[PDB]
Design an enzyme around this catalytic site. Structure first.
Site, short mmCIF file in Angstrom:
data_model
loop_
_atom_site.label_atom_id
_atom_site.label_comp_id
_atom_site.label_asym_id
_atom_site.label_seq_id
_atom_site.Cartn_x
_atom_site.Cartn_y
_atom_site.Cartn_z
N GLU A 163 0.82 -1.23 0.00
CA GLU A 163 0.00 0.00 0.00
C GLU A 163 0.85 1.27 0.00
OE1 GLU A 163 -2.53 -0.73 3.40
OE2 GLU A 163 -4.01 -1.79 2.17
N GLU A 351 -5.32 -8.62 0.64
CA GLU A 351 -6.06 -8.28 1.86
C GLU A 351 -7.52 -8.07 1.51
OE1 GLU A 351 -4.72 -4.99 4.19
OE2 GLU A 351 -2.59 -5.60 4.16
#
Ligand code: NA
Ligand code: NA
Ligand code: NA
Length: 444
Positions: A163, A351
């Protein structure tokens, strides 16, 4: 037959600072998040990851717990401050933890997926300028090269960064994450040095020619809807989509930053870090893309200020983060990647999961039926993407266990396993029992 093939990987995910604890043991020095969580007002109730889930000491029990659930793959991150606790100072004791962790995984038929950087930058690196200092590309390359050389026989699936939108914009512009700056130009430069560091690790990796080994990156992606069909809201959604998604998808997979965002950001800050040589390194071919998906955004035009879209509440169910439960965007984003960016390249969901108000009831169980239904709805979209020809190779639930949720501290519980932090007891939630059945039956 099977909705998910025998080779499809059903996984779970954690990150080093969120679960390990042992923050000052075996040579580990502070990360930017140890420092940030000690600054007043930065983290809920001054929580920190000194102890967290104590996974550093309890890893054998945790691997056994994953084996008994039938977990096929485990995504974790490696703590840079354990491996290089000082600049140029390798710590074998730090490496030994990841050897015994991954040895335990492999011996229990669990495939390791290792994230090289999941936000725990060593404090010594930040004191030298951190991601704002282009020299970090070399420091990160040295770190990644050491991991590949020492662990290449243990780990065959590597993720450079988790991320980078969070490590850049949320950490240097919004200021919610470590190191907590609030300056758009810094966030843009950091985003570039992150991507360049990713490129350096990919270059090193390809030169090593490791047998049967794959490398990729993990991006948090959403889907942005305009609140109405107006031109105003259409531009607002375009900017919001460029901010979250295209600012990273375009340099990685097209070799060019999205030109509308370069022009938009250029009205407010310098964008002079862009050059051809760096974008060539940034856009080297990957083996897979990891997608972190949680929610969508519905936006309407704001005040014509910097990134000031109004967040619309469409009135649907939400998690305890305030995130709308909107499973169709998982399918939409995977299809968007197949049609616009990654084409036939393997995708993993690295995720997906949800925070709910979990309570251990008097029967000793955690009846988290909202999380069962959340995961059910999203795995159904994964199945639909597969049946429509998408190249989805696996799906990692965030998270194996409740843990330190960054600026929220321990107040948001994402696990399929509940952690009683006073005793460090693990309690399987009903979502873990549901997931165990999904893995065993491969039917949804
Ligand atoms: Na920790
Ligand atoms: Na603290
Ligand atoms: Na690629």
């Amino acid at each position: 037959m099977k909705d998910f093939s025998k080779d499809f990987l059903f996984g779970v995910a954690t990150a080093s600072y969120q679960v390990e604890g042992a923050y000052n043991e075996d040579g580990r020095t502070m990360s930017i998040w140890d420092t940030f969580s000690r600054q007043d007002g930065k983290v809920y109730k001054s929580h920190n990851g000194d102890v967290a889930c104590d996974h550093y000491h309890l890893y054998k029990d945790d691997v056994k717990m994953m084996k008994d659930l039938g977990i096929e793959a485990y995504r974790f991150s490696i703590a840079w401050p354990r491996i290089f606790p000082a600049k140029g100072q390798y710590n074998p004791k730090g490496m030994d933890f990841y050897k015994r962790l991954t040895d335990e995984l492999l011996k229990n038929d669990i495939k390791p997926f290792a994230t090289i950087y999941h936000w725990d930058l060593p404090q010594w690196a930040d004191d030298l300028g951190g991601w704002l200092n282009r020299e970090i590309v070399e420091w990160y390359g040295e770190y990644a090269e050491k991991l590949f050389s020492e662990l290449g026989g243990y780990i065959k699936n590597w993720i450079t960064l988790n991320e980078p939108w969070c490590s850049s914009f949320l950490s240097y512009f919004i200021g919610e994450h470590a190191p907590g700056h609030k300056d758009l130009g810094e966030a843009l430069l950091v985003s570039h040095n992150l991507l360049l560091s990713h490129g350096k690790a990919v270059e090193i990796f390809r030169g090593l020619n490791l047998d049967d080994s794959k490398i990729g990156i993990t991006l948090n992606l959403n889907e942005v809807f305009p609140a109405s069909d107006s031109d105003d809201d259409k531009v607002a959604a375009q900017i919001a989509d460029g901010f979250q998604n295209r600012w990273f998808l375009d340099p990685l997979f097209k070799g060019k930053y999205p030109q509308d965002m370069v022009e938009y950001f250029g009205k407010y800050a310098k964008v002079d870090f862009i050059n051809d040589e760096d974008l060539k390194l940034i856009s080297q071919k990957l083996d897979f893309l990891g997608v972190n998906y949680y929610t969508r955004a519905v936006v309407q035009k704001g005040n014509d200020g910097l990134l000031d879209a109004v967040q619309i509440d469409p009135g649907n169910e939400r998690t305890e983060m305030g995130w709308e439960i909107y499973p169709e965007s998982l399918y939409n984003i995977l299809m968007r990647l197949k049609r616009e960016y990654t084409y036939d390249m393997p995708l993993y969901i690295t995720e997906n999961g949800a925070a709910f108000n979990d309570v251990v009831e008097d029967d000793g169980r955690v009846h988290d039926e909202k999380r069962v239904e959340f995961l059910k709805q999203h795995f159904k979209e994964a199945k639909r993407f597969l049946n429509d020809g998408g190249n989805l190779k696996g799906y990692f639930v965030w998270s194996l266990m409740d843990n330190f949720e960054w600026a929220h501290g321990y107040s948001k519980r994402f696990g399929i396993v509940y952690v009683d932090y006073e005793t460090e007891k693990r309690i399987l939630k009903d979502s873990a029992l549901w997931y165990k059945d999904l893995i065993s039956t491969r039917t949804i």
